[PDB]
Structures are given as C-alpha cells and as structure tokens.
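Notes, p. 3: input format for complexes.
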Amino acid sequence: MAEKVAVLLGGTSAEREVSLLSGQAVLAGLKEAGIDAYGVDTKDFPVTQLKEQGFDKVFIALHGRGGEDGTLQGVLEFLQLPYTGSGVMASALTMDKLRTKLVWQALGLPISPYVALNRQQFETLSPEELVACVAKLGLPLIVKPSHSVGMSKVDHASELQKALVEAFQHDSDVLIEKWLSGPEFTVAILGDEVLPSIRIQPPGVKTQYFCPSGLSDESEQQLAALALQAYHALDCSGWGRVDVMQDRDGHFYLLEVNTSPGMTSHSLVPMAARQYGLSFSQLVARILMLAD
Amino acid sequence: MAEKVAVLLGGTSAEREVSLLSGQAVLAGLKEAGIDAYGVDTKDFPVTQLKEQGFDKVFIALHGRGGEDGTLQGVLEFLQLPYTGSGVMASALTMDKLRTKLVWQALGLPISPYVALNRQQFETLSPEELVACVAKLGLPLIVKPSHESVGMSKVDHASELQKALVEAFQHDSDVLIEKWLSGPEFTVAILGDEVLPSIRIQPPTQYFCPSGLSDESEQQLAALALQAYHALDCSGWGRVDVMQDRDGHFYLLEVNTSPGMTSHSLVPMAARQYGLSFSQLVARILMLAD
Ligand code: NA
Ligand code: NA
Ligand code: NA
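Output follows (582 residues plus sodium ion):
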C-alpha cells in the first residue's frame, strides 16, 4: 500500500546541471517527509521502464526539452503512472509562445500588443512592407522565435530586418512585440493557492530576487488573480509559475507559464513558498499530494 | 538496409475495430509501394519497445485515446522514432474543443457562437441563471463536454438544458454550449501542404465528393481549412471538419489528427478524387515523417 516514488532528475537537456540540483533537493525534501522516494537520473535510466522498476508515482524535476514539454508526460500517461505538474496538453502548449498568447488573448487577458509572422509572409514581403506591418506597435520592439536564443531589441525601423533574419533561423513562427519597461514578476501556483509574487532584477554586468515584491497590496491582489486565470486558461494543474511583466503605466502583461520550475535552494518557487510559510519539505510533499 | 516501418494498429481504445481495418489497409498500401512494413497490434505489443525491436519509422493508424491525443506521440518522441501525423502539442490540443476554439477565435477564424461553463459556475448557478447565460445563442443548442458521442445532446427547449448540463458534467469539468447550425457539413483532408477535395456529408449516411460547392466556395473552404490546421500546429496530415449556416458561411468544428484509413473512410475518398491510389496516399503520409 505505501507508494514508491521516482524523482526524475538530470536528463539530457541543456538544463541538466540545474535539474540534478532540483532533483537532489526534492529527493531530500521528500525523504524528510517520510516518502519512499528514489532518485532516477533519466540520462541513464529510460523513463519507459519506470513501471517495470516498481514505481507507483512520479515527481518530475527535469527542466526543458523532454521534461516540461509534454513528451515525458505522454510516456507517463501511456504507463498510467500519476505524476506531478501539468498534463500533456498544458506542458506542451506552454512551450509555444504564439499559441499561449492566442488563448490568453481570446479570453481577454492582457498581453503585450504584437504581430506574428510565419515563414511564407517573411519570404513574400519586402523589408518596407514588414516595417509597415509592425508600425502600430511603435518602438522599441522585441523580436523572438515562437518556441532562450534568437531574441533582439529593435530600437528603430531599419534594425527590424536583421532581427527577423536571426529569429527565422530557429523557427518558422516569429513574434514581434511592443517593448515593455518592466520590471518582471513571477507568481508561483500550488494547487489552487497563489503564492507571493517575486520581483526579478536581471543582471546588467548576479540576478536579484525580491520577495516581498514591493507592490502595493491592491497591485498584488490583481496580479495574483491574473496569474491564476492565466494558469487555468492553459489547463495547468498541480503546480507551476506564471511570469508577468509590468509596463510604464503599471499594468501587468502575461509572458509565459513554466510547467516544471526550478527547485534548487536558490530557485523561485521555494523562495515564494518560504515566504508563504512553507518549508521546502512541505512544498514538495504538497506537490506530490496533488498528483493522483 | 531499407527502413523497417511499424504500422501501429488496433490498440485498446473504443475505436479498436476501426483501427484494425485502417491498419490492415495501410499495411497493404505501404507494401504495394515498396516499403518494408510490418503490422503491430499495440494491444499485444508495447509501443515502448518499438526501437528495441528494430523499427526505424512509425505509421500511426490507431484512433482515439492513446492514438491521436498526444500520449503515443510523446512515447515516440522519447524513443526518437519518426512518425506520421501531428506532434504532441497539436495532437493533444485538437482533443480540447474549448482551447481549439479559443485559438481559432483569436486568429479571427469563424466559429459558431458558444458559451463555455466550468464546474464552479455549474454548482454556483440556478437552472434559470444558466438558461439566461445561454439565451443569446437561441435554440436549438448543442451541449457537450470540452474533451471527447459520450455526453453530448441537442437541447430543443430551455427546459431541457439542465438535464443536458448534468449529463455533460459527468465526463468533464468544462462544458460547451453551442448554437445549432443548419448545415451541411464538410470535411477537408490535408496532406502535407496540399488540400484535397472536400467531401459533403449528409446525415440520414451519405458522402458526396465532389462536394457540390462552386469553384470559388471550394477555394475559400480550402484556404480556410489550411488556416485552421496550421493554427493548431498540425503537420503531416489530418482532416478538418467544417459546417455551413443557412446563409452559406463556413464555421470550423474540429481537426482530427489520426483519421480513419479503411477502404470506406473519408481521407481515402478525397485522395481517390484527387487522383491518388490508396497506396500512393499512405506512401505520401509516410514520406512526410522525418
Ligand atoms: Na511546459
Ligand atoms: Na488529436
Ligand atoms: Na455574409
């Protein structure tokens, strides 16, 4: 009757080294709570054998490709093992910045004005026609692939073409967004509970996090309700984090949802959890409890 | 070495019997084109061992749960085998009728008026408040769960709504109430970047290909179907289902990411009209997997 829990960690993606640390910490947190957990480095053990190996339940602490993008989640649904975080559709949809935006937009949720361009339009249209496509966005602009690399800030119209070429190296769909002044915030969600937001200050020569975020009580409440809508819009469950950006006018704009967040002692979700009053061990036991 | 190709067929879903027929036909079609293909009934053989067994490539001819919903596609991505049809995101997004509609709607593509309801609203609101939520849709109405038929009804009078909502909320926490459309229904098969000839569907069941539309209407529908398909990130192949209203406007219904491939199915019928044999069809679909 007691459950054997596999903590999937490391793997083969670019984020392997961070995932080893998330996994190690999750493992020690689950053990502290009395959970019969085992570390499973998926670089050396194939996730297709988890069931044969005796596991009843899975905690996902991989990041990036093969971890948070739906592929692993599909394996686990095929094996019929319960697992933490979001299902197939949500894990994959949250990787696609265009379709994430489209869903949010149809629900009237705030996103930064933008224009999407596919490959066929890029090949069809002259640099001057492209400039006219995006004129209503004003300046400056952010150009990026829909699926980080290949991103540029465009300060005037003449710089657009170069930024579009670079972005179309990596993808057949590209986003041109109106630039936002910042700062950036992230909001962790655990089950139905929204945790305290964190303000992020990225380096300029190191990354700094502030929790409490510094927002007014009224702003926090708006941001919390917004994050929760953004998360439910994409059909996320279990847990995740919503990244939001402020503009000069103080309004929030939705960036993305991360469906397998970092769990190292320096990561964001543990920081918000601690501020909410949970120990790391309580956090991980709660995430696991939300898998059924 | 010629590539060894696995044709996944049968499985354990409600559509097993149709998938055995699709798979049998695909198998014979691929062999006729010179492909080294083998039938693999996934009820008896686990898909997680396809690579160990020596397969280089996969043709998906399963339907329904575990075939066209992203889970199988995730196994195959993990194993790094190329496979036919759409990837994980598109396979799974096409099963979520709410999100499919939201994406289409944000792109300005035509869908029928509708209201979405979650479980918390259903528990919160009185039958009369629900009737008022959907009054703007008029009558009759189609009530259905947001994910895969099972809990789906036609509501002819306001008084029937509650019962139809109860039934739908048996199977899902999100439910769609949609305005009924006078028809007829069409389906548009897509193969790579090529749109095939539409088929008109007449429920009593009859299929017409050519569909009977004017050249100009066919062109619009073809362009519309292609946008609908690309909107949801589909690739390889699939079918787009579209419906007319009384004034002839097209409305998008759904995209099917692993269509029937029996000798009597719709995609083979459109392909035959386009000038392809069934063997050519399946060889094309396989070629689009890389
Ligand atoms: Na994700
Ligand atoms: Na699908
Ligand atoms: Na009209």
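The pocket of sodium ion (ligand 3) is lined by residues B 247, 249 (CB under 6 Å).
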